[PDB]
Symmetry: C9
């Protein structure tokens, strides 16, 4: 009663569900249009994905010597920053950035 189910067609990853519900609960339930719900799937999927990439990054950072892959480490660092910046834009698009909600 205090949230909204994700649209099935949009492919919310199951592990993104706790992120999804946090975002839905950050503005009035009646202000979520069907279009907004589609966009919110991608926000939640991105927030989940940062945690996945950070795990990969930390794994690669623990490797020392010949098998260490500096290129992959560099790429993962950048991918995380790009996701973070995208998420800020996604929040603003949904009016769940702080300026709107606070």
């Amino acid at each position: 009663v205090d949230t909204i189910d994700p649209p099935s067609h949009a492919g919310l990853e199951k592990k993104a569900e706790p992120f999804w519900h946090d975002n839905i609960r950050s503005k009035a339930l009646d202000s979520w249009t069907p279009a907004d719900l589609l966009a919110a799937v991608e926000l939640a999927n991105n927030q989940l994905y940062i945690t996945v990439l950070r795990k990969d990054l930390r794994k690669e950072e623990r490797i020392r010597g010949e098998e260490r892959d500096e290129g992959l480490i560099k790429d993962l660092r950048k991918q995380i920053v790009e996701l973070q910046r995208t998420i800020l834009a996604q929040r603003r698009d949904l009016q769940i950035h702080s300026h709107a909600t606070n």
Copy 2:
């Protein structure tokens, strides 16, 4: 409660549920023919993210010599670029939240 997509614009069949969600997010009488064309591309992009994510997750499950790090990197970026484009497409159609709330 909705509008049929313009045939010439080539809405992908699996993009239909995305299409209808977007059409239902502003008043039916505010959809111009130009807007309907733009909305086909929005829906096609929203569908396509799901397609590229499926490809990405497949590549991520591959371990060892056949794993393709370059392809993984390229797919990650393609998804981000689609997402950013979709935000612009929503604003162009006035179905971003600032307009509809």
Copy 3:
């Protein structure tokens, strides 16, 4: 022209298959607000909208190819070309005042 539209300027080279896109755009603001300059710009808008469908067909063909003949570089380039067309179209809509903010 039909009484609810405008013919495209011949010199601008509207593609035949772009015609249904053209008419959709023309019909999205008042007929009397289309200047001759705007009509030139609208040809390029319609041509771009058509061209996305053409590139998507090429892309889907390339995506169905598996094994040695698959061309990952071409697939990457087509994905980007479609996004660049889409973004250009948004600017072209705004330039013509047929984006939603203007019309709705």
Copy 4:
């Protein structure tokens, strides 16, 4: 009586003339300064040139097999987009974009 001749020194291509006159007729004749007329030559030349590049592109796209030039196709696609974006800026500079005229 309803248009203006292009400045000879500016090098309007002859096939760009129908584009030129369309643009001149899109704001009041008395609002065309000599500076604007120079700028309008380049607008018209660019609008013509898109049609030229599209013809080249379509020619290259019809070629299949060993002689197909994917690099040239990619370059022409980008050149057309860059011209289109430039033309939007050129229209705004001349106040013949729709916001000004409509």
Copy 5:
């Protein structure tokens, strides 16, 4: 949580050593103005602030190396990564309304 802060959302994966950064940020606007969405965003802010200190340690280690084993490329990349994190953090602060313009 302590009565002047908020627990981080477990699913977001706040790093243990990011906790003191987390609490500093939470305590920089009213507790009741933290939406669940904001709390997710704040995890990434805190994780980034921690990560700068980690990268700076790696950088300083590489800078102490002289001769054949010195890796100028890695040093260059780490310098840039730190600047990119710093710039991202400024955007993350503004998104949360904990930049100075909002709070002061």
Copy 6:
């Protein structure tokens, strides 16, 4: 009805008709010495587009082994960059249409 260009700025001789067109597009008394320097570069750029287009068209007429696709690509871009610069130069001088209309 016009102003002589500052000699030190090196207005190209064939840029003169461009120069005078620009000078005549705002009040003569509003041309500061600084503006006159900037206007030399505007006129020189407007002339130079015509020069580069002549080179480009020459290269485009060449077919076969001597055709230089790289040079053609570079000239196309140089022209676009000049055009975009000219728009900025017009705005800097307040001879863009928004100012003069």
Copy 7:
């Protein structure tokens, strides 16, 4: 008349005089804990410019075969990027001049 830096943020010891100068440039009661974290990075960057300039000047004094033009170029750019970042960091903290004057 000042505030201690948060230990977890890793203010470099030689950055301390920079830190205190920045803290003293707006009211003490307007420094939130979040601002104090951001100010550590500002001070660390201000210190680091001096470090990179020392390295740059050392490389510039080298003549002949051991001179490293690539390193010189990279250091020049790193300094400019730090400087630009610092301007953004000042604005974020409202210690740029527009805010404090």
Copy 8:
């Protein structure tokens, strides 16, 4: 200085041939509105305006060369350097409030 201008600051290194550019710029806003900081900035503006003429001379020389000694790369680089100077000069004018919007 002549009574309608200001001497350049010696430490800033105004090029001798940049002097006529310098004086044109100084004379484009009130003498009393030139701060010492502005005078430093104006040295760089004048030096850039002079330098365009220098680069254009080099470019025209290279453009007259035909055959094996022609250096297309250098020609390309000089064209871009001139455009970058021109764009920088517009920003330098605005920074000094001697762009037309300010003065006219």
Copy 9:
């Protein structure tokens, strides 16, 4: 009495001192915060450094034949432009750009 000493820790280069004092004298002495003084060191250092790089550039430009280094010439030209653009931002940050002072 009409200027301010630079903060020692900030590493103002000695040859940048005349630039420093010119900038300090371009707004009211009481409006220079300690933070502004740090920033002003980097402004002055950059203004000095343009003169240094121009000297290097002119030296390289006088070299003809096999020893001429076109890459270095290109890099120095760009470095000067980047410094100049940075200085404009540094002036605005300190409110000693003309819009603020005039």
